[PDB]
Amino acid sequence: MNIFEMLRIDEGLRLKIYKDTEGYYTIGIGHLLTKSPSLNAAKSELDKAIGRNCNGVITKDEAEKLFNQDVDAAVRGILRNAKLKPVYDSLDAVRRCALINMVFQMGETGVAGFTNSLRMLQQKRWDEAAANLAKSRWYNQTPNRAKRVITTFRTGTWDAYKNL
């Protein structure tokens, strides 16, 4: 298992514009298009992102390309973030994947807001951190995904995903 297969499980793949769990216009593998209510604003963002008139639909290849960019930008964002970088550097390879997943879903800024949990992860207090991460809107809104990520941080294995 790797970051790509992990995120593909969590986000799914959709070739037509869709609304995400928060109601935002998205396409592909969790690629947010716009927080705007206009399908039109979404179609425009899409065409801008792919470089062709897509008419709200993309190919598998196009989705994978967006996905590659997004994973890349997620990692680079963690590496540039003063709060995130140290945590990331302190973690093992599996746990690094769990942090990248949060960043991909909720953005750098959102994750950087989890001050206490970040401190616990840095300290390698697995159980305490899993419990603290669960006290968030994130866990309440997308509990199955949050549980998978949380288990990954707690155990440092891919057990939560070997099921799936």
Curated annotation (Swiss-Prot):
* Naturally occurring in which organism (per UniProt): Enterobacteria phage T4 (Bacteriophage T4)
Q: What is the effect of changing D20C?
A: Nearly no effet on specific enzymatic activity
Q: Tell me the HAMAP family matching this sequence.
A: ENDOLYSIN_T4
The alphabetized list of GO BP terms reads:
cell wall macromolecule catabolic process; defense response to bacterium; peptidoglycan catabolic process; viral release from host cell by cytolysis
The record's GO molecular-function terms, alphabetically, read:
lysozyme activity
Principal localisation = host cell
Q: What induces it?
A: Expressed late in the viral replication.
This chain's protein is named Endolysin
How is the activity of this protein governed by pH, according to its UniProt record? Optimum pH is 7.3.
Q: Where in the cell is it found?
A: Host cytoplasm
A Pfam family matched in the record: Phage_lysozyme
- Recorded consequence of changing T26E: Complete loss of activity at neutral pH; covalently bound substrate
Q: Could you list this entry's UniProt keywords, alphabetically sorted.
A: Antimicrobial, Bacteriolytic enzyme, Cytolysis, Glycosidase, Host cell lysis by virus, Host cytoplasm, Hydrolase, Viral release from host cell
Q: What is its EC number?
A: 3.2.1.17
Summarizing the annotation, the consequence of altering G30A is: Almost complete loss of enzymatic activity
What is the purpose of this protein? Endolysin with lysozyme activity that degrades host peptidoglycans and participates with the holin and spanin proteins in the sequential events which lead to the programmed host cell lysis releasing the mature viral particles. Once the holin has permeabilized the host cell membrane, the endolysin can reach the periplasm and break down the peptidoglycan layer.
* Family in the record: Belongs to the glycosyl hydrolase 24 family.
Catalyzed chemical reaction(s): Hydrolysis of (1->4)-beta-linkages between N-acetylmuramic acid and N-acetyl-D-glucosamine residues in a peptidoglycan and between N-acetyl-D-glucosamine residues in chitodextrins
Effect the entry attributes to changing N132 to M/F: 2-fold decrease in enzymatic activity
Q: Which amino acids does the record list as binding substrate?
A: L32, F104, S117, N132
